[model samples]
Target: AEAWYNLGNAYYKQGDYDEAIEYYQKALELDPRSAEAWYNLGNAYYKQGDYDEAIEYYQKALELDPRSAEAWYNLGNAYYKQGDYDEAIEYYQKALELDPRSAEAWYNLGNAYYKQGDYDEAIEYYQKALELDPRSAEAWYNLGNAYYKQGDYDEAIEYYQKALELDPRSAEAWYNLGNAYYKQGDYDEAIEYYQKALELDPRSAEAWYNLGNAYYKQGDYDEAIEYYQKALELDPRSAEAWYNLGNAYYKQGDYDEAIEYYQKALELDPRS
Candidate 1:
C-alpha cells in the first residue's frame, strides 16, 4: 500500500494528476481504510477540475477520519469551484470548527460571502483573516472593497492604503483609492491617485472615464474632454463617455460639437 501511495505522491508532484489518481486507487484497493490515500485521490481529482469526483473522495476521507480539518477545507474548495458557494460556506464552517486557527479557511469563507453580496459578513471574515495573517494584501484589498460597497469611504481608503503599502504595483487598488477620494469630493487627491493607476495601467477605459468625471466635477471641461476622448479611444461603445463629452462641449459654449457628440451618444443608446 505504501509503495503505490508513494508513487501517487511522486506523480502528483510531477503535475500528472491522472497518473496520481491511478496509483492512489491502486493503493486504496489494498488498504480501503487508508484515509490519506482517499484524501490524495480527492486532491488529484481536484487538480483535474473534477470537482464532483473530488467531493466524493473527500467524503470518503472524512468518513474514515472525522478529525481531518484539511479534508473539510478541501471539500469547501471543491464545492466553491463548482459555484456551490453555500455548500462551500458550510464545509469551511466545519473546518473552522475543527481548526479555528486557519486564516486561509477564513479568507476563502469571506470570499464566499462577498460573492453572495453579503459585504458585512464578508468584512468580518476578512477582519478575522487579517487578525490571523496580517501581511495579506488581498485581504486588505477585499476589506476595502467591502467598505466601499457599504459607502464607508473613510474605512475603504484606509484599508486600500494598507493594501498599497503591501503591494504598491496594484493598479486596481490605486483606482479604488481614487474613487474613495472622489466620493469625498477631494478631486485633487482623486486626480493624484488616478494618475498613479493610469501610469501603472494605461489601457483602462473605466479609469479614464472616472478621471474625466473627476475633472468635470472640478469645472475643468477642457481637461474632462481630453480624458473622455482618451476613454473613447479605448472603448468606443461607451455612451457615458459620448454623453459626458457632449455635456463638456455644451458647458464650453461649443453647441455644434456638443450636438455632434449628443447625436453619437443617442446613436449608441436610442433610449437615451
Candidate 2:
C-alpha cells in the first residue's frame, strides 16, 4: 500500500491526477492510517473543486499526521472556499509553523488577509511570499492591487511594472497599469496603455470607458464620443458611458443630443 501510494504521488507529479486519485483511493482502502494517501486524495479533490470532500480528507490526513504542512495548507484552501476565513487562517498559520519557508502558504495567507481588508497584514505576507519567490508574477500583481487600493499609485505602478516585466502576456497587468496612469492624471500615458489593454481585450467595458476619459481630458470631444459609443456598444447599461457621451455632445454645441444622452444616463443611474 505504501509503495502504491508513492506510485500515486509519482503519477500526480506527472499531472495525471485522475489516475493518481484512483490509486490513492486503493491505497487508502488498504491502509486507512496512511496519512500520505489521505493528503494526496485531498489534493486530487481540490483540483476537481470538491472542496468540501477535500477538507474531510485533509482532516483525516492531519489526524494521522498532524505535522503535515502540505495537508494543513490544503485544508486552509478548503476552508477558504467555505467562507470560514478564520479557520482558513488558522490552518495556513499551522502550515507556516510546520514549514516556514512555504511561499504558497504565505501567499494564500496574504489573500485571506487582503479579503478581510487587513492590508498591512496582507502586505507583510505578500512581502514574505515575494522574498521566497521573487519571480512570482502573481505576488507582484497582488502587491500592486493592495497598494492601489491604499491610494499608493506610484508604488502600485512600480509593482504592476514588475509583474509585467515577469509576465508580459498579462492583460490584467496592462489594465492595472492603465488605471495607475489614469489616477496620476497622466492622460496620454493612460490612453496609450488603455489602448494596448483593449488590443489585448476588446471586450473590456472598463477599458473602453477609461480610454474615452483619456480622450475627453485632452479636449478631444469627437474621439471621446466615439470611444464612449464603443463602450456603450459593449455594455449598453453603462451609466458613465452615457454621461460622458452627453458631455461630448454638449462640447460639440449639440444641446438636443446632449439632453437625450443625459436622459439616458439618468435612466441608467437614477440616483445620478
Candidate 3:
C-alpha cells in the first residue's frame, strides 16, 4: 500500500493525474483508512478539474485525520474554484488556524475576501501574506489592485512599482500602471506606460484604445486616429472605439469619415 502511494506521488508530480489516480485507488483498496492516500487522490481529482469529486475525497481524508491542514487548504481551493467565496474563506481560516505561517493560505484568504468586495479585509490579509513572503509578485500586484479599488491611486502605483521590480516582464502591471497614471490626470506618464504595455503585448486592444484616449486628451487627433484604427483592427466590435474614432475624424475636419464611423458605432450599440 505504501509503495503504491509513493508511486502515485511520483505520477502526480509528473502531472499524470490518470496514472496517479490509478495508483492511489490501489493504495486505498489495500489500506482503506490511509488518510495520505485519500488526500493524494483528492489532489489528483482536483488536478483533473473534478472539484466536486476532489471535495468528496478530501472530506474522507479529513474524516480519518481531522487535523490535516493540507486537506483543509485543498477544500478551500476547491470551494474557491466553485465561486463559493464565503465557504472558501471559512476553510482557509481553518487552515490558517492549523498553520498560521502559511503564505499560500494567507494569500488565498485575501483573494476570497477580495472577491466578496471586502477590500479592507483583503488588504489586511495581503499584508500578512507579504510579511511572510515579501518577494511574492502576485501578492504585490493584488495589493495594488485592492488599493486601486479603494481610490488610492498613489498607493496602487507604489505596489505596482514593487511588483514590476520583482517581475518587469508583467504586461498587466504596466497596463495597470498606465491606468493609475491616467486616473491621476497625468496623460504623458499614462502614454509612456501604455506604450510600454503595447511593446509587451501589441494585441491588447484595450491598451490601444486607451492610448487613443491619451492622445486625444493631448490634442493630437491624428495620433489618436492611428491608435483607434489599430484598436478597431484588433476588436472591430468595440462600439466605444468606433465612437472615439468618429470624434477624432470630426476634429480633423473629415466630416464624411466621421459620419461613417458614427453610424458604425450606432449600429454596434444603439443605446450608447
lDDT of 3 by residue, 1-272 (tens): 99999999999999999999999999999999899999989989999999999999999999999898889999999999989999899999999999999999999999999999999999999999999999999999999999999999999999999999999999999999999999999999999999999999999999999999999988899999999999999999999999999999999999999999999999999997
Q: lDDT per residue, candidate 2, 1-272, as tens digits?
A: 98879888988899888898988988988999888788889998888778898999999989999988888888999999888889999999999999999999999999998888888888899999999999999999999998988888999999999999999888789989898998998898889889888888899888889899899988999999889988999999878789989999999899999999999999888897
Off by over 4 Å in 2: 1-26, 265-272
Model 1 CA deviation exceeding 4 Å by range? 266-268
> What global local distance difference test value does model 2 have?
0.90
Error of 2 at 89 (Å): 1.7
Candidate 1 structure quality by residue, lDDT tens digits, 77-184: 999999999999999999999999999999999999988889999999999999999999999999999999889999999999999999999999999999999999
Q: Rank the candidates by lDDT, best first.
A: 1, 3, 2
Compared with the true structure, all predictions reach lDDT values of 0.96, 0.90, 0.95
Greater TM-score among 2 and 3 belongs to 3
RMSD of each: 2.4, 2.9, 1.5
> lDDT score, residue 127, model 1?
98
Higher lDDT: candidate 2 or 3? 3
Leading candidate by lDDT = 1
